[PDB]
Design a binder for this molecule. Sequence first.
Ligand SMILES: OCCNC(=S)N[C@H]1C[C@@H]2C=C[C@H]1C2
Length: 209
Amino acid sequence: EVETFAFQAEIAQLMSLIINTFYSNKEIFLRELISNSSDALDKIRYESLTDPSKLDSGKELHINLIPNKQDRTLTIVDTGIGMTKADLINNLGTIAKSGTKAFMEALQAGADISMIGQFGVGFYSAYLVAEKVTVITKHNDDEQYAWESSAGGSFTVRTDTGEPMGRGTKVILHLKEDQTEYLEERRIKEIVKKHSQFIGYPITLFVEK
Ligand SMILES: OCCNC(=S)N[C@H]1C[C@@H]2C=C[C@H]1C2
């Protein structure tokens, strides 16, 4: 059972701007997704202080970076708080509407795309490098879901039947054909050191077989 939804017009506009604007400094997508993962980890860690059972779905708080040249995917996995179905369809998009508007006005006043994270919508910088993004997520209070969008104004949500996650979020970047440098170990290492050196959780960069 796959459900198809229309993006809010403002988010579709943000996605088109990210996809169509000429802007060479694409590597910042990784900082924005790692920052999102760090925030999700902060949330479950804080909530576990008053309800330790919230970690029954997994004690480890970490971030894994998994490149796969065969599938041409870069996967960012965290064991954070995860997202509910309502998060995927309604809640986060509602919040992102005001952040998108502020970001759009800032860009017109001279900001650049690298400052997208200051407006809370850094996730969508994934489309600087990905033609399709798949998000697998599991929140303690809900089922495991797959969100997916290739832009163009629509996204899908389905119950995920694959390997159970325990808790957290997996962002699968199906990279554009000319963006495969983000599958190279030395390139990912360089970006993490430059932009994500002080993240307060272990970041493991997987090596390819
Ligand atoms: O996870 C926090 C960042 N997410 C944002 S800003 N927006 C939503 C769009 C995609 C589906 C749910 C999330 C990712």
